[PDB]
Amino acid sequence: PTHLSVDTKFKTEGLCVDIPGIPKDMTYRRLISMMGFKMNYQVNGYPNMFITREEAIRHVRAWIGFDVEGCHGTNLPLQLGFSTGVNLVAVPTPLMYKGLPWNVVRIKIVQMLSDTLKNLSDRVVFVLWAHGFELTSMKYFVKIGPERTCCLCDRRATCFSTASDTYACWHHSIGFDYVYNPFMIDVQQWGFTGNLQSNHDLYCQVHGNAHVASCDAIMTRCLAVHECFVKRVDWTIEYPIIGDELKINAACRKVQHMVVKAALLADKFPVLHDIGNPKAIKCVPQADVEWKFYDAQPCSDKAYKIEELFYSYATHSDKFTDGVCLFWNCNVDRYPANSIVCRFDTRVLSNLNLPGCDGGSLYVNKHAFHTPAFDKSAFVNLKQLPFFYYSDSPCESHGIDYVPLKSATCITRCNLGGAVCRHHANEYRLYLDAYNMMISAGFSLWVYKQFDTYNLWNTFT
Numbered sequence: 001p002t003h004l005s006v007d008t009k010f011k012t013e014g015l016c017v018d019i020p021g022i023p024k025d026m027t028y029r030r031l032i033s034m035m036g037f038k039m040n041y042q043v044n045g046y047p048n049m050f051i052t053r054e055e056a057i058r059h060v061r062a063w064i065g066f067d068v069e070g071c072h073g074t075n076l077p078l079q080l081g082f083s084t085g086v087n088l089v090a091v092p093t094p095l096m097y098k099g100l101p102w103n104v105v106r107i108k109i110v111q112m113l114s115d116t117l118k119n120l121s122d123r124v125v126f127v128l129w130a131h132g133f134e135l136t137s138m139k140y141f142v143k144i145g146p147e148r149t150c151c152l153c154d155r156r157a158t159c160f161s162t163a164s165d166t167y168a169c170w171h172h173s174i175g176f177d178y179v180y181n182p183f184m185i186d187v188q189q190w191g192f193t194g195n196l197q198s199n200h201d202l203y204c205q206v207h208g209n210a211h212v213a214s215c216d217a218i219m220t221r222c223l224a225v226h227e228c229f230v231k232r233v234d235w236t237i238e239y240p241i242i243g244d245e246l247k248i249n250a251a252c253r254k255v256q257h258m259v260v261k262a263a264l265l266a267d268k269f270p271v272l273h274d275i276g277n278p279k280a281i282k283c284v285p286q287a288d289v290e291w292k293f294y295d296a297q298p299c300s301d302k303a304y305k306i307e308e309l310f311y312s313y314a315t316h317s318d319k320f321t322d323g324v325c326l327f328w329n330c331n332v333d334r335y336p337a338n339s340i341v342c343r344f345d346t347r348v349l350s351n352l353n354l355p356g357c358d359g360g361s362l363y364v365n366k367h368a369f370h371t372p373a374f375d376k377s378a379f380v381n382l383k384q385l386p387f388f389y390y391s392d393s394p395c396e397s398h399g400i401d402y403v404p405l406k407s408a409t410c411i412t413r414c415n416l417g418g419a420v421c422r423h424h425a426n427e428y429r430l431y432l433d434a435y436n437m438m439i440s441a442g443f444s445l446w447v448y449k450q451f452d453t454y455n456l457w458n459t460f461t
Ligand SMILES: COc1cccc(C(=O)Nc2ccccc2F)c1
Pocket: 273, 275, 294, 308, 309, 310, 311, 312, 313, 315, 316, 317, 318, 319, 320
């Protein structure tokens, strides 16, 4: 059971208003045939247009919500809506486009999907809340067949051109008119009571219903993300490398060690309360400090209430006011004043961050992590942590060209003494690169208000 069997049953109740008289007993095989697609028995890597929930989750980067509202089906114009916010009107003669025939509409579909997905995925997964018109309109912009490779590269083919009789991936499809071998999943098959709006609105107040096809397409993908990443969490699903994942993760580790090592040196806290990942290790293993861990998995729904993290039932809680609290990606509602905090900004635009549910986002780097909406009020007791580099390693080169470094934020013995050595200048530039990478990925750093880098200079006495 790797793929979805075409002989699986498809509940057709959601399809009977657009398709009155639809048989109650229906397989994917018959539905695909009814949609105009002839599979001709093909063992070539594309066994079904429809996929399982498990396969949809593994391909979350490919998700595109799709809804079709029948404005007036071959007689009446259809409004095509995508979770990109695009609305295309197709005539058979929140970006709203005027009524145009299918031959030109299909060119716009290929362009939009290619520009949206070329850096995210090797495919498209149309996420539906199927009522009928969306499935029967697919034949107007979709071609299917054996799995293929791009005419210009080795990537999987996602588009086909009737003008050149050629196939292309999302990167080489300019001017192509057909979506080739797409995937699709119907959320309505998962067993919901009531319509799309009522189920979506139970978990999200950010997507309204301005009564356009894109509003439903956005709500559909959002409800799917809630089901697969908010109420259900699977951190064992490994995701491919599509960008700066490795550099970002390495930068996070370097920044964490730097900031924690410096706060401990500057304010000599006797104890550190490490609140977050149950699998975390000491980021500063040489520090004197009493290191105490508290397990709290990444919250995918709402940010943790600081009160419930301290909630100890019939026993006493550990004192948090003693020493410093470290919250490295531990999303809470309001941090204590004695904290070192790394909070992901869900609003960041990137290929790793996908739109999520109720203001939150789905950060996909090796694993998928739905993160609750970034809330500036969480940090009222803290200040933004300024960039600085700290080093107490000996001034020794060991060796890339060089230009003299002049920086007030290079906290080293050599800078104190009047001139940064080449080694600390190379390490400062590498650290600043890592720092910028982590900030640009969407992470924000916060610290207790008494934090002052001036206190680091006296560690060179
Ligand atoms: C010092 O900072 C923290 C941070 C987070 C949690 C605790 C704590 O003591 N929690 C606790 C204790 C006994 C039973 C259940 C619990 F959740 C202390």
